[PDB]
Structure 1
Amino acid sequence: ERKLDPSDALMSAGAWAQRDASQEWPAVTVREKSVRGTISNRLKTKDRDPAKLDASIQSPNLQTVDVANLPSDADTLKVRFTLRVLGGAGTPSACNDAAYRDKLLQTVATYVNDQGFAELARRYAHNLANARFLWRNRVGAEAVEVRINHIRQGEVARAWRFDALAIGLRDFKADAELDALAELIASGLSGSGHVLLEVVAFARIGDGQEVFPSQELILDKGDKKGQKSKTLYSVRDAAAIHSQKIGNALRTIDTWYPDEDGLGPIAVEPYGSVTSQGKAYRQPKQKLDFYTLLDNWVLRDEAPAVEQQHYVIANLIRGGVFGEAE
């Protein structure tokens, strides 16, 4: 009775746009309209080999001429402007409604169950601290991923717009906010009251974000790389394709979701160490870890696999409902 779905799939509510990096000077911070985009340059490298050898079986004449030579390739490394101190990241993340109304329903009884569970976990557990996870661990600008490293002051300006007009205009300073523990902020509770007005289906909400890392002049970045699968043979020159919008430098939405999908310290191992990206199987791509392994019971794919039969997770539900928000 009431088996699991044969094929379930949920829409990514709480969506995310692309970023267009563009560079600015402070006290010209407010006038970010004619701020020019940052073209992915083409540096042309040469190096040595820091990648080690394979330790099984060798011939010793290889490695000397291996190390001594030059791996001189071209590398499309996006670089800042000459006389620009600030930065830019223009992303309208719009939050969809319907936290657990599905997109595929391989059994309608399971859909009535899961709508019952959005009714419970949206009726009982208020989304105050829930969206305080999706804001207080994404206003502290994990938005800006590797370019967050040693900013002077990375200022986030989450404007919010009905229309061409914009009413919710909240400004921040994301270096005054940690990335390991969410601390009590009033305006962060306003923004989480607004994502409260988003995920529980109250209003059209698209948060136009304009993050300004005030780091320095011509320094490098952390733009999202493309790939070199069957394109390292026709060109065979580039090795790091920093991906582009029309004439600018992307941050791919794929990276941009674990800026905000980094929610739960509700994992198995850590206490205040690691706040990973709230996923099915909770796997971070960096560490090659599997937080919340199969043998543990903190899977997303054990949260309705137990909750759809026995109704007990008890506030690890949030890392089993936010696995369904995206």
Structure 2
Amino acid sequence: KLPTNLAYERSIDPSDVCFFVVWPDDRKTPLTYNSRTLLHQVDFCHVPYGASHIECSFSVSFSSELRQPYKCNSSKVKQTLVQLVELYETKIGWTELATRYLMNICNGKWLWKNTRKAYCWNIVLTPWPWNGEKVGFEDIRTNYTSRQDFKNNKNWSAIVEMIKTAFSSTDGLAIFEVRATLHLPTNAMVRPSQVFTSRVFQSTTIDGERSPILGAFKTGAAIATIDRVGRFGVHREDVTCYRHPSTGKDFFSILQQAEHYIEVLSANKTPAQETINDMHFLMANLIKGGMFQH
């Protein structure tokens, strides 16, 4: 069933996270880390003494690139996938995926372990296109800890709506610019991404000096952690992978049931236990993108 050529392009496009240090004068300087070597390289990054709060900013942009396959060897599977996307959108809606993708943006999941011992951290983002004030979340640790807590925000429906339109309409696009404010303790440990190769961080020069960074792919993993969404339910810490091919609930064993899913989505009310979750997994994998060649 899988054509010799079948590739999708990602719809969620996260960017790098750049850490900034805020002084009591409110002037901001890029965060810097020390490197120690023995005569083996170990990297240390801590909040400088006297710093008020660490600030992290990045931009994530949604797009409707899951509407049709980027490349497709055969025309039959192309219209099959397009009809599947249309039927899912019309019958189930993008609300669940939009909320799951937006909660990780707002609750600070992308900060990973940097929010472990912070007293309080705030998330304020400016969406685009926008027509009013910036969306603001205060004290995520205590205030916003659940779906109901997020929905009780002043304009939670408005922000999640523009993601639905971006996913639905062709050429539709929504851009967010997140800005975290971390009130870390004095000389608290900050944990950025470590480059593939001991502890050595990823670095990009900001304002003429190097700074620790969180990789764009690494931040995408936290944003897309909705189940991490992938072909198989791979778990990073515990090596074993769920949704194994034997379990019959991987991406491919679900993708090859496209005709059955098309029949189900149009016949009667789909079961919320089995078919709906499979549809959610299929569209979550489609949003991530990749190649399904063989």
> Smaller-chain TM-score range?
0.7 to 0.9
1:74, 1:321 → 2: CA distance? 42
TM-score (structure 1 length as normaliser): 0.75
- Alignment match, 2:204: 245
- SS state at 1:302 partner: helix
- Alignment match, 2:230: 279
Matching of residue 190 in structure 1 with residue 158 in structure 2: yes
- Alignment match, 2:112: 145
- Alignment match, 1:37: 30
- SS state at 1:22 partner: strand
81 and 122 in structure 1: CA distance in 2 versus 1, 3 angstrom threshold: same
TM-score (structure 2 length as normaliser): 0.82
Contact 2:104 2:110 in 1 (8 A): no
User: Structure 1: which 5+ residue stretches go unaligned?
Assistant: 46-71, 229-238, 265-276
User: Structure 2: which 5+ residue stretches go unaligned?
Assistant: 265-273, 289-294
- Alignment match, 1:69: none
193 and 186 in structure 1: CA distance in 2 versus 1, 3 angstrom threshold: farther
- Kindly provide the CA deviation profile for residues 99-122 of structure 1, in whole angstroms up to 9, marking residues without a partner as x: 242112121210111011110111
Once the 2 structures are TM-superposed, how far is the Cα of residue 318 of structure 1 from its aligned partner? 0.7
- Alignment match, 1:263: 226
Q: How does 1:1-326 map to 2 (within 5 A)?
A: 3-24=1-22, 34-44=27-37, 73-162=40-129, 167=132, 169-172=134-137, 173-175=139-141, 176-178=143-145, 182-183=147-148, 185-187=151-153, 188-201=156-169, 203-228=172-197, 239-246=198-205, 247-264=210-227, 277-311=228-262, 312=264, 314-316=275-277, 317-326=279-288
Once the 2 structures are TM-superposed, how far is the Cα of residue 309 of structure 1 from its aligned partner? 4.7
Once the 2 structures are TM-superposed, how far is the Cα of residue 262 of structure 1 from its aligned partner? 0.8
Contact 2:202 2:212 in 1 (8 A): yes
Structure 1 segments (4+ residues) deviating >6 Å: none
Once the 2 structures are TM-superposed, how far is the Cα of residue 194 of structure 1 from its aligned partner? 2.2
User: More displaced, 288-297 or 116-125?
Assistant: 288-297
289 and 220 in structure 1: CA distance in 2 versus 1, 3 angstrom threshold: same
Which amino acid counterpart does residue 244 of structure 1 have in structure 2? S
1:129, 1:214 → 2: CA distance? 31
1:322, 1:168 → 2: CA distance? 30
Contact 2:41 2:200 in 1 (8 A): no
Contact 2:10 2:65 in 1 (8 A): no
1:9, 1:43 → 2: CA distance? 44
- Kindly provide the CA deviation profile for residues 166-187 of structure 1, in whole angstroms up to 9, marking residues without a partner as x: 7451111322344xx6435233
What number of residue pairs does the alignment pair up?
A: 267
1:205, 1:78 → 2: CA distance? 34
- Kindly provide the CA deviation profile for residues 290-323 of structure 1, in whole angstroms up to 9, marking residues without a partner as x: 1212122321222221124553562111111111
2:284, 2:236 → 1: CA distance? 18
RMSD of Structure 2 on Structure 1 (CA) = 2.4
Once the 2 structures are TM-superposed, how far is the Cα of residue 214 of structure 1 from its aligned partner? 1.4
Between Structure 1 and Structure 2, the one with more helix by share is 2
Between Structure 1 and Structure 2, the one with more strand by share is 2
Once the 2 structures are TM-superposed, how far is the Cα of residue 77 of structure 1 from its aligned partner? 1.9
Which amino acid counterpart does residue 140 of structure 2 have in structure 1? A
User: More displaced, 12-21 or 247-256?
Assistant: 247-256
Identity of paired residues, percent? Answer: 5
Higher relative contact order (CA 8 A, sep 6+): 2
1:117, 1:156 → 2: CA distance? 35
In our comparison, the structure showing a higher alpha carbon Rg is 1
1:227, 1:209 → 2: CA distance? 26
1:183, 1:298 → 2: CA distance? 30
Contact 2:167 2:173 in 1 (8 A): no
1:73, 1:130 → 2: CA distance? 44
16 and 245 in structure 1: CA distance in 2 versus 1, 3 angstrom threshold: same
2:257, 2:98 → 1: CA distance? 24
1:194, 1:186 → 2: CA distance? 18
- SS state at 1:295 partner: helix
219 and 209 in structure 1: CA distance in 2 versus 1, 3 angstrom threshold: same
